[PDB]
C-alpha cells in the first residue's frame, strides 16, 4: 500500500489460500493418476520406452519437478506470492503483506498482519509499522518529539505525566513494552533455515546424482565436507545471537509520577510521556530510555554510544521561554539523556508544581521506548549486518549462467555423437547430466562475504571496527576523500600564546597598521583577567576532576586560578581576588559567542584600584563582538586579521558592569534576557591560541594525494585559518582565491585582488585554470541550483564556514555526479554528513597507551561501535584512513583472483569429462578422490596472503564483466582445451580402439591434474597489492610439493605410488611428449595472463584526481631524496 519509508521499495497485499489450491499440489494431483493408469493397464508405450530404467527416470523427473515447485516458494518471495497466495482487494480483507526493501537493506519477506482494537500493524526487521487511514498508507510510529511541526518547550515544561488509567492502557497498546526483543532459536530451526538454501540442496542433488553412477567414496567425502561446514556456520550464528542477547540492560526499580503519586515501578514499563526521576546509576546499569531533563543538571558518561569515556555536562530546559521558543535540536542538544549512558553526579534536587521525588533526583520526561532509541537502532542494525549475503548475488548468478553455456555446448555435442553410435540411452543421459552439473561452482556467490570477513579481521588489529560490513568493497573505489578540521587534522593540545591588541585606543606596527605587540596572560589587566575567569563553563566533580572543553581547561591552567566548590574561583597571577558565577549563557555555534554573569571582588596588588559588584563577561568571535561594542578602536580589524592570518585562533573579550557596589538580587539575575545583557560592552583584548598539527597529518595526506585520490577539506572556521592549514598540510599548492561576501567578490589572502562576479554568469575559465579556489558557505548558498554550481564542485578543495546542513548538501552534490566519497569527522558536530557519504569514519581520541593498559573480529560490544558513523577508529592517528583504503583495495583483488580460479577449474573438469565420455571409459573412484583432496589442499594453502605497506597508483577493477577477467579466462581455457584435444588425438593414434586401467585414462588424468595446478600457479594476484608468490614459503612449498608429486608420478620416479591411482606404465617417447606438452601449456598460460594483466588490468583515475606535471616532478624528486636518505 505504498508504505512511507526511505528504506522500502514497494508493497503488495495478499490473502492466504488453502492447501488444496496451492500451486504445488493440484496439478500433481491431476497428473499422478494419469501416470499410474499409463504404467498399470493403459499400455500406451508410444510415449514411453519400456524398461525399468525409464520408469525410474519418469518417477525421478516427476518428484524433482514437484519438489522444485515447492522449493521455489522458499527461494524467492515473488514466487511465494504467486504460487501460494493471491492478490487481495484492499486493506479490509487482506491478511498478508509483501515488503521489498531498498537495494542494500536486507531481504524481502512476507509479513503477517495483526489486527487489534481498528489498528493494523505488522513487524518488518523488528521495526513496527502502523496503518493510518487518513493517509491511506503504512508508516512507522510517530513520537511527540518528532512531529512535523516542532513542539514548543511549553509541552515539556508543564507536563504532568500520565493522569488517567485508560490513557495508560492506550499507550500500552500503542507503543508496547520498553525492552529489546531478540529471540534466539535452537539448532533445529537454524538447520531447517540453512537446509532449504538453493546451493545446499543443489549440492545434495549432485551428491545423489554421483552416487547413482556407482561412486561410493566421492559422494561420502562431499557429503561430509558439506555437512561439517554447515554445522560450523550454524553454531557460529547461534553463538553470535547469544552474545547479541547478552547485552540487554537488566530491569531495575525507578520512580514514576503516575496518577498523582510517586509510585515505584520497574524500568520495563516506561511509556512515552512519563515523568521519571533520574538518580545516580549503579554498577552494571544505565539510563532506561531516551529522556529530556526538566529540572536540575546532571553529569553523564556516554561511553556506550560514541566510544569516548570523557565526562560531559547536561543542563535542563527549566530557564527557557516556555511557549515563545520552538524546540530545536541544535541549541538544546545539552538536555537529552540517551538510553545507555551512565549518570555520574547530580547537582541540584518547579514550574509544573510537582512535589519533589523521595529519592532526591532530577526529573525527566520519556520520549522514545524500545528499538526506537539510538542504541536500540544500533543494536537492530548490527543484528542484520548480513546484508552482503541477501541483497546480493545478481552478478555471480550471471557468471554461473555464462559458464552453463560452455557446459551445454559440450553436453549437446556428447549427446549428438552418442545418438549416432547406438549407445544405451539410460547411461548417455546420465553422462550428459553429469557433464552439465560438474560446472556450477558451489562456493562462487558467497566469495565476497568470505573476503569481507577476512579483511575485517585485519582491520580489527589497528582498533578499527565496522558496523555495516558491506561498505568494505566501497573503500576500494574512492575518488574523493573529504576531510574535516579541528577533530581530524589538528589535535587538542592547545597552548595559550598570550593576550594581544589590548593597547588599542591608548608601538610596533605594519603596513596595514596592525599592532604586533603581544603581552603574556600573567602581566595583563585586571578586567581581562576577570573576563577570562568569568566567561567559562567549567564544573568540577566531587572527586576532583575538571570536565569541559579543552580550550577552557587550557586557559584556566594558563590563568593560574583554582576552581572551588560551587562555581567559585580564587587565587602566579597578581590579581588576588575571587569570583562567583550566578547565571551562564551557553555557546550556540550560531551566535558565535558565550556570556556569563558573576559577582566579583578584586584587589590589584600594584596600584590598588578596588573593584567589586556585578560583572558581565562575554567571549566570542572577533567579528561578532565588533557589532556589540560602543566605540571600536582605530586598528581593530587590521589587528585581528593579522593575528588570524598566521593560523592562530583569535577570540575577543568584552566586559560590562551592572552595579558598582552590591548584589543585583536573586530575582533580578534569575530574570534577564540575553539580548539586553549582550549590549553596551567595553573592550579588553584578544586571546591568541595555536592548535598544533597532528604528527601523522602530512604523511597521511601525501599518501592519499599520490594514490589516485583527491583530498578536499570541509571545515567550519574562518577562511584564512582554513587556507593556512590547507597550505601546511599540502592540499593546495598555487595561489588561492577566497569567494565570499565583501556581492560575492573574489578575495585574496593578502587582500590585493578584488574581482566581482555575478552568480548568473558562468565563472571565468582563467580563474578555474590558474588559481585554486576556497568557496565559503554564503557564496555557495547564493550559487544554489544555477549554472555555475556544477563547476564549483569540480575545482574547489577548501570549503570554509559551512553549516552542518551544507556539509551533507555538498556530499550529496558530489555523489550525484558519480563520484565515491569518504567523510572523516569527530562524530559529534556532523552526524548526517557521516551517513550521507558512501563510507564514513569517526576518528576518536584514544591514545595507544590507553589501549596498552586496557575468523571474524570479536563481536562488537556496546563500547566498541559508534552511533554516528559506520566505521570507528579508537586511535587518534590520521593514518587510520589509508589502512581502510588499503584493505578495501585488497578485498577486490582477492575476490577477482577467486573468481578467475574457480571458473577455470570448473571448465577444466567439464572438458576433461567430455573428452573421456566420448570413448565410453570413465574415471576411477580413487583417482577423482585424490584429485579432489589435492585441489582442496591447494585451496587451503593458497589463501594465506598479506598486504604491502603502502598505497599504489594502480586501482583494481570493481566488477566481474570487463576486458580483463573474460579475456584471460577465454585464453587460458582455449589453451587448455587445445592441449587436451592434442593429447587425446595422440593417445588415439598410439593405441587404436567395469573400470580397468588404460593409457588414455592415465594421460587425461595426469594432464588435468597438471592443468589444475598450473591454474593455481599462474592466476595468483601478486606484486602491486599483496605479497608476491615467491616471498612467502607457505604457498610456494605447497605448490612445489604437489607439482613435484604429479611430475614424479608422470615420469615414474616412484613406481610404488603409481599403483595407488591405477596408472598404466608408459614408454620413453610418450613420457617425453607429455612433459614437453605440459611445459608448453604452462608457459603459454603464463604469457597470456601476463600480457592481459599488463594491458587491461589498470582502472585509470578519474578526471578529478589527475595531477599536473609539476606535482609529478615534485613527487619524483621527493621519492628520490627519500631513497637517497634511506642509507
Instruction: Quote the cell numbers at residue 850.
Output: 590507553
CA pair distance 1000, 986, nearest whole angstrom: 9
Task: Name residues whose C-beta falls within 8 Å of residue 1035's C-beta, 6 or more positions apart in sequence.
Answer: 941, 942, 944, 945, 1020, 1029
Which residue in the block uniquely carries the three cell numbers 560583572? 615
Binding site for ADP: which residues?
A: 587, 649, 716, 801, 829
Domain ranges of the chain: 8-141, 142-169+251-371, 187-247, 389-448+884-1096, 462-491+693-883, 495-690
Instruction: Quote the cell numbers at residue 67.
Output: 519438489
* Separation of CA 664 from chain center: 54
Instruction: Quote the cell numbers at residue 542.
Output: 566531587
Q: DSSP secondary-structure letter at 251?
A: P
Do the strands 685-690 and 649-656 form a parallel or antiparallel pair, or are they unpaired? antiparallel
Q: DSSP secondary-structure letter at 1099?
A: B
Do the strands 796-799 and 710-714 form a parallel or antiparallel pair, or are they unpaired? parallel
CATH topology of domain 142-169+251-371: 2.70.150
Task: Name residues whose C-beta falls within 8 Å of residue 38's C-beta, 6 or more positions apart in sequence.
Answer: 44, 47, 48
- Of the candidates 369, 199, 195, 154, the one whose C-alpha atom is nearest the C-alpha of residue 276 is 369
How many CB atoms neighbour CB 251 within 10 A?
15
CA pair distance 1025, 1007, nearest whole angstrom: 32
Question: Do residues 917 and 416 lie in contact, with contact meaning Cβ atoms separated by under 8 Å?
Answer: no
- Of the candidates 775, 805, 781, 770, the one whose C-alpha atom is nearest the C-alpha of residue 793 is 775
Quote the longest CA-to-CA distance of the chain: 128
Instruction: Quote the cell numbers at residue 680.
Output: 553596551
Kindly list the distances between the CA atom of residue 921 and the CA atoms of 313, 410, 861, 1062, in Å, as whole numbers in the listed order: 82, 17, 59, 14
Binding site: which residues?
A: 484, 486, 587, 649, 716, 801, 826, 829-830
Helix (H) or strand (E) holding 1103: none
CA pair distance 898, 960, nearest whole angstrom: 11
CA pair distance 940, 934, nearest whole angstrom: 10
Question: Do residues 486 and 717 lie in contact, with contact meaning Cβ atoms separated by under 8 Å?
Answer: yes
- Of the candidates 907, 925, 918, the one whose C-alpha atom is nearest the C-alpha of residue 966 is 907
Task: Name residues whose C-beta falls within 8 Å of residue 127's C-beta, 6 or more positions apart in sequence.
Answer: 140, 371, 380
- Of the candidate CATH numbers 3.40.50.2300, 2.120.10.30, 3.90.1200.10, 3.40.1110.10, the domain formed by 495-690 belongs to 3.40.1110.10
Residue 379's φ and ψ, nearest 5 degrees, are: -65, -40
- Of the candidates 249, 191, 214, the one whose C-alpha atom is nearest the C-alpha of residue 373 is 249
Does residue 696 sit in helix, strand or coil? coil
What is the three-state SS of 140-209? ECCCHHHCCCCCECHHHHCCCCECCHHHHHHHHHHHCCCCCCCCCCCHHHHHHHHCCCHHHHHHHHHHHH
Q: Looking at domain 389-448+884-1096, does it have CATH number 1.20.1110.10? A: yes
Q: What is the dihedral of CA 386, 389, 390, 391, to 10 degrees?
A: 100
- Edge to edge, the sheet with strand 253-258 lists 261-266, 253-258, 275-278, 362-365, 293-295
Instruction: Quote the cell numbers at residue 881.
Output: 584512513
CA pair distance 819, 812, nearest whole angstrom: 10
Q: Which long-range contacts (CB under 8 A, 24 or more apart) does 1035-1038 make?
A: 1035/941, 1035/942, 1035/944, 1035/945, 1038/937, 1038/938, 1038/941, 1038/942
Axis crossing angle, helix 999-1018 with helix 1068-1096, rounded to the nearest 10: 30
Q: DSSP secondary-structure letter at 40?
A: I
Does residue 345 sit in helix, strand or coil? strand
Axis crossing angle, helix 52-75 with helix 26-37, rounded to the nearest 10: 180
Does residue 927 sit in helix, strand or coil? helix
Active-site annotation, residues? 484
CA pair distance 594, 674, nearest whole angstrom: 10
Question: Do residues 906 and 441 lie in contact, with contact meaning Cβ atoms separated by under 8 Å?
Answer: yes
**Burial group, residue 1116, by CB count within 10 angstroms (0-12, 13-18, 19+):** exposed
CA pair distance 293, 260, nearest whole angstrom: 20
Does residue 653 sit in helix, strand or coil? strand
Question: Do residues 60 and 426 lie in contact, with contact meaning Cβ atoms separated by under 8 Å?
Answer: no
Resolution in A: 3.4
Helix (H) or strand (E) holding 249: none
Binding site for Mg(2+): which residues?
A: 484, 486, 826, 830
CA pair distance 622, 1022, nearest whole angstrom: 57
- The answer to whether the Cα torsion of 343, 345, 349, 350 is positive or negative is negative
Question: Do residues 382 and 470 lie in contact, with contact meaning Cβ atoms separated by under 8 Å?
Answer: no
Which residues in the chain precede a discontinuity of more than 2.5 Å between C and N? 117, 349, 506, 571, 742, 854, 993
Task: Name residues whose C-beta falls within 8 Å of residue 499's C-beta, 6 or more positions apart in sequence.
Answer: 518, 519, 520, 521, 524, 528, 685, 686, 687, 688
Q: Please list the helix, strand and coil fractions of the chain in percent, rounded to the nearest 5, in that order.
A: 40, 15, 40
CA pair distance 712, 692, nearest whole angstrom: 20
Q: Looking at domain 462-491+693-883, does it have CATH number 3.40.50.1000? A: yes
Question: Do residues 834 and 868 lie in contact, with contact meaning Cβ atoms separated by under 8 Å?
Answer: yes
CA pair distance 400, 378, nearest whole angstrom: 36
Kindly list the distances between the CA atom of residue 109 and the CA atoms of 181, 289, 408, 599, in Å, as whole numbers in the listed order: 19, 30, 34, 66
Which residue in the block uniquely carries the three cell numbers 575567569? 533
CA pair distance 910, 404, nearest whole angstrom: 11
How many CB atoms neighbour CB 152 within 10 A?
16
Instruction: Quote the cell numbers at residue 32.
Output: 499422478
Question: Do residues 299 and 314 lie in contact, with contact meaning Cβ atoms separated by under 8 Å?
Answer: yes
DSSP 271-299: -TT-EEEE----TT----SB--EEES-EE
DSSP lists the bridge partners of residue 807 as none
Looking at 391-512, list the stretches that DSSP marks H as alpha helix, in order from N- to C-terminal side: 396-419, 425-437, 447-459
DSSP 1044-1087: HHHHHHHHTS-HHHHTTTT-----HHHHHHHHHHHHHHHHHHHH
Does residue 261 sit in helix, strand or coil? strand
Kindly list the distances between the CA atom of residue 1022 and the CA atoms of 1010, 1029, 1030, in Å, as whole numbers in the listed order: 21, 6, 9
∠ CA(541), CA(543), CA(548), 5° rounding? 30
- Edge to edge, the sheet with strand 109-112 lists 86-87, 8-15, 96-101, 109-112
Q: Which long-range contacts (CB under 8 A, 24 or more apart) does 667-675 make?
A: 669/582, 669/583, 669/597, 670/319, 670/583, 672/583, 672/597, 674/585, 674/595
Instruction: Quote the cell numbers at residue 853.
Output: 593498559
Does residue 957 sit in helix, strand or coil? coil
Residue 735's φ and ψ, nearest 5 degrees, are: -70, 140
Kindly list the distances between the CA atom of residue 866 and the CA atoms of 73, 432, 861, in Å, as whole numbers in the listed order: 39, 55, 10
Q: What is the dihedral of CA 58, 63, 69, 75, to 10 degrees?
A: -130
- Of the candidates 384, 391, 383, the one whose C-alpha atom is nearest the C-alpha of residue 77 is 391
E strands, 93-156, are 96-101, 109-112, 114-116, 119-124, 127-132, 137-140
- Of the candidates 399, 453, 267, 417, the one whose C-alpha atom is nearest the C-alpha of residue 906 is 399
- Edge to edge, the sheet with strand 871-873 lists 464-466, 871-873, 839-843, 821-825, 480-483, 710-714, 796-799, 772-775, 736-740, 745-747, 754-756
Task: Name residues whose C-beta falls within 8 Å of residue 856's C-beta, 6 or more positions apart in sequence.
Answer: 236, 453, 456, 457
How many CB atoms neighbour CB 374 within 10 A?
17
DSSP 728-746: HTTS--S-EEEEE----EE
Amino acid at each position: 500500500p505504498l508504505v512511507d519509508n526511505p528504506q522500502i521499495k514497494s508493497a503488495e497485499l495478499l490473502r492466504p489460500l488453502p492447501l488444496y489450491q496451492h500451486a504445488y499440489v493440484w496439478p500433481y494431483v491431476i497428473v499422478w493418476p494419469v501416470f499410474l493408469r499409463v504404467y498399470l493397464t493403459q499400455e500406451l508405450y508410444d510415449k514411453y520406452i519400456g524398461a525399468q530404467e525409464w520408469t525410474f527416470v519418469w518417477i525421478i523427473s516427476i518428484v524433482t519437478f514437484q519438489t522444485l515447485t515447492w522449493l521455489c516458494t522458499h527461494w524467492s518471495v515473488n514466487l511465494n506470492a504467486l504460487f501460494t497466495a493471491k492478490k487481495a482487494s484492499s486493506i479490509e480483507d487482506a491478511q498478508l503483506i509483501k515488503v521489498i526493501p531498498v537495494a542494500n537493506a536486507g531481504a524481502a519477506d512476507i509479513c503477517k498482519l495483526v489486527r487489534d482494537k481498528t489498528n493494523i500493524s505488522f513487524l518488518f526487521q523488528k521495526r513496527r509499522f502502523l496503518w493510518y487511514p487518513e493517509r491511506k498508507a503504512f508508516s512507522t510510529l510517530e513520537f511527540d518529539i518528532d512531529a512535523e511541526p516542532k513542539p514548543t518547550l511549553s509541552k515539556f515544561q508543564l507536563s504532568r505525566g500520565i493522569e488517567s488509567e485508560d490513557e495508560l492502557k492506550r499507550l500500552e497498546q500503542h507503543y508496547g513494552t520498553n525492552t529489546f526483543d531478540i529471540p534466539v532459536p535452537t539448532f533445529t530451526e537454524l538447520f531447517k533455515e540453512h537446509a532449504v538454501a538453493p546451493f545446499f540442496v543443489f549440492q545434495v542433488f549432485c551428491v545423489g546424482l554421483w552416487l547413482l553412477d556407482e561412486y561410493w567414496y566421492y559422494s561420502l567425502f562431499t557429503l561430509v565436507m558439506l555437512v561439517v561446514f554447515e554445522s560450523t556456520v550454524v553454531w557460529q550464528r547461534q553463538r553470535t545471537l547469544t552474545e547479541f542477547r547478552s547485552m540487554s540492560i537488566k530491569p531495575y526499580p525507578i520512580y514514576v509520577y503516575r496518577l498523582g503519586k510517586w509510585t515505584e515501578i520497574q524500568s520495563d514499563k516506561l511509556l512515552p510521556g512519563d515523568l521519571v526521576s533520574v538518580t545516580r546509576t549503579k554498577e552494571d546499569s544505565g539510563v532506561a530510555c531516551d529522556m529530556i531533563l526538566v529540572e536540575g543538571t546532571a553529569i553523564v558518561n556516554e561511553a556506550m554510544l560514541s566510544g569516548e569515556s570523557t565526562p560531559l555536562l547536561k543542563d535542563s530546559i527549566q530557564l527557557r521561554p516556555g511557549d515563545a521558543v520552538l524546540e530545536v535540536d541544535g541549541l538544546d542538544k545539552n538536555s537529552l539523556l540517551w538510553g545507555g549512558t551512565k549518570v555520574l553526579q547530580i547537582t541540584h534536587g518547579p514550574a509544573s508544581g510537582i512535589p519533589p521525588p523521595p529519592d532526591n533526583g532530577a526529573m525527566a520526561v520519556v520520549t522514545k521506548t524500545g528499538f526506537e532509541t539510538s542504541q536500540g537502532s544500533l543494536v537492530r542494525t548490527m543484528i542484520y549486518s548480513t546484508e552482503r549475503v541477501s541483497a546480493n548475488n545478481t552478478e555471480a548468478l550471471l557468471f554461473i549462467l555464462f559458464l552453463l553455456v560452455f557446459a551445454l555446448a559440450a553436453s549437446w555435442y556428447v549427446w549428438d555423437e552418442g545418438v549416432r553410435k547406438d549407445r544405451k540411452r539410460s547411461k548417455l543421459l546420465l553422462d550428459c547430466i553429469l557433464i552439465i552439473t560438474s560446472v556450477v561452482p558451489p562456493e562462487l556467490p558467497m566469495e565476497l562475504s568470505l573476503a569481507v570477513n577476512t579483511s575485517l579481521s585485519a582491520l580489527a588489529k589497528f582498533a578499527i571496527f565496522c558496523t555495516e560490513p558491506f561498505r568494505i568493497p566501497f573503500a576500494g573505489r574512492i575518488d574523493v576523500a573529504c576531510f574535516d578540521k579541528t577533530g581530524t587534522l589538528t589535535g587538542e593540545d592547545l597552548v595559550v600564546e598570550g593576550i594581544a591588541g589590548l593597547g588599542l585606543g591608548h608601538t610596533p606596527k605594519e603596513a596595514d597598521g596592525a599592532h604586533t605587540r603581544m603581552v603574556s596572560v600573567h602581566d595583563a589587566g585586571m578586567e581581562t583577567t576577570l573576563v577570562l575567569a568569568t566567561a567559562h563553563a567549567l564544573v568540577k566533580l566531587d572527586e576532583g576532576e575538571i570536565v569541559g572543553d579543552p580550550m577552557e581547561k587550557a586557559t584556566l591552567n594558563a590563568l593560574g586560578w583554582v576552581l572551588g566548590k560551587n562555581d567559585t574561583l580564587t587565587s602566579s597571577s597578581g590579581i588576588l581576588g575571587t569570583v562567583q558565577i550566578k547565571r551562564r549563557f551557553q555557546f550556540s555555534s550560531a551566535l558565535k559567542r558565550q556570556s556569563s554573569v558573576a559577582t566579583i571582588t578584586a584587589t590589584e596588588v600594584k596600584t590598588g584600584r578596588k573593584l567589586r559588584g556585578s560583572f558581565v563577561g562575554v567571549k566570542g568571535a572577533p567579528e561578532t563582538i565588533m557589532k556589540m561594542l560602543v566605540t571600536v578602536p582605530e586598528h581593530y580589524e587590521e589587528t585581528y586579521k593579522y593575528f588570524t592570518r598566521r593560523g592562530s585562533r583569535v577570540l575577543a573579550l568584552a566586559y560590562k558592569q551592572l552595579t558598582t557596589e552590591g548584589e543585583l538580587g536573586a530575582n533580578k539575575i534569575n530574570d534577564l534576557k540575553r539580548e539586553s545583557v549582550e549590549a553596551d560592552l567595553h573592550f579588553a583584548g584578544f586571546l591568541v591560541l595555536q592548535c598544533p598539527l597532528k604528527e601523522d597529518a602530512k604523511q597521511a595526506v601525501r599518501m592519499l594525494n599520490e594514490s589516485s585520490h583527491r583530498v578536499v577539506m570541509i571545515t567550519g572556521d574562518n577562511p584564512l585559518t582554513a587556507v593556512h592549514v590547507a597550505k601546511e598540510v599540502e592540499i593546495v599548492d598555487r595561489d588561492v582565491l577566497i569567494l565570499d561576501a565583501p556581492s560575492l567578490v573574489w578575495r585574496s589572502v593578502d587582500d590585493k585582488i578584488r574581482i566581482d562576479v555575478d552568480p548568473t554568469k558562468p565563472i571565468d575559465p582563467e580563474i578555474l585554470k590558474t588559481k585554486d579556489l576556497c568557496v565559503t558557505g554564503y557564496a555557495l548558498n547564493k550559487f544554489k541550483g544555477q549554472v555555475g554550481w556544477k563547476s564549483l564542485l569540480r575545482y574547489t578543495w577548501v570549503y570554509a564556514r559551512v553549516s552542518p546542513k551544507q556539509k551533507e548538501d555538498i556530499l550529496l552534490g558530489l555523489k550525484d555526479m558519480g563520484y565515491y566519497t569518504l567523510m572523516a569527522g569527530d562524530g559529534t558536530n556532523d552526524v548526517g554528513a557521516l551517513k550521507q557519504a558512501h563510507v564514513g569514519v569517526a576518528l576518536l581520541n584514544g591514545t595507544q597507551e590507553d589501549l596498552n593498559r586496557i575468523d571474524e573480529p570479536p563481536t562488537l560490544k556496546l563500547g566498541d561501535a559508534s552511533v554516528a558513523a559506520p566505521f570507528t577508529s579508537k586511535l587518534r592517528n590520521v593514518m587510520a584512513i589509508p589502512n581502510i583504503l588499503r584493505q578495501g583495495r585488497c578485498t577486490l583483488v582477492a575476490t577477482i583472483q577467486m573468481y578467475k580460479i574457480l571458473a577455470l577449474n570448473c571448465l577444466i573438469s567439464a572438458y576433461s569429462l567430455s573428452v573421456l565420455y566420448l570413448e565410453g571409459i570413465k574415471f576411477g573412484d580413487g583417482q577423482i578422490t585424490i584429485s579432489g583432496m589435492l585441489m582442496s589442499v591447494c585451496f587451503l594453502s593458497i589463501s594465506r596472503a598479506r598486504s604491502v605497506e603502502g598505497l599504489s597508483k594502480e586501482r583494481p577493477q570493481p566488477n566481474i564483466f570487463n576486458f580483463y577477467i573474460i579475456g584471460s579466462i577465454l585464453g587460458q581455457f582455449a589453451v587448455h582445451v587445445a592441449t587436451l584435444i592434442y593429447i587425446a588425438q595422440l593417445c588415439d593414434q598410439i593405441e587404436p580402439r567395469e573400470f580397468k586401467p588404460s593409457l588414455l585414462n592415465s594421460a587425461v588424468y595426469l594432464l588435468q591434474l597438471i592443468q589444475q595446478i598450473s591454474t593455481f600457479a599462474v592466476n595468483y594476484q601478486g606484486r602491486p597489492f599483496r605479497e608476491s608468490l615467491s616471498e612467502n614459503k607457505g604457498m610456494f612449498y605447497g605448490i612445489v610439493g604437489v607439482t613435484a608429486i604429479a611430475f614424479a608420478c608422470s615420469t615414474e620416479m616412484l613406481p610404488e605410488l603409481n599403483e595407488a591411482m591405477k596408472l598404466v606404465p608408459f614408454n620413453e617417447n610418450f613420457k617425453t611428449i607429455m612433459t614437453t606438452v605440459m611445459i608448453i601449456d604452462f608457459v603459454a598460460c603464463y604469457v597470456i595472463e601476463w600480457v592481459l594483466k599488463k594491458l587491461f588490468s589498470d582502472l585509470r583515475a578519474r578526471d578529478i584526481a589527475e595531477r599536473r606535471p609539476d606535482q609529478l616532478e615534485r613527487e619524483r624528486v621527493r621519492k628520490e631524496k627519500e631513497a637517497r636518505e634511506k642509507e
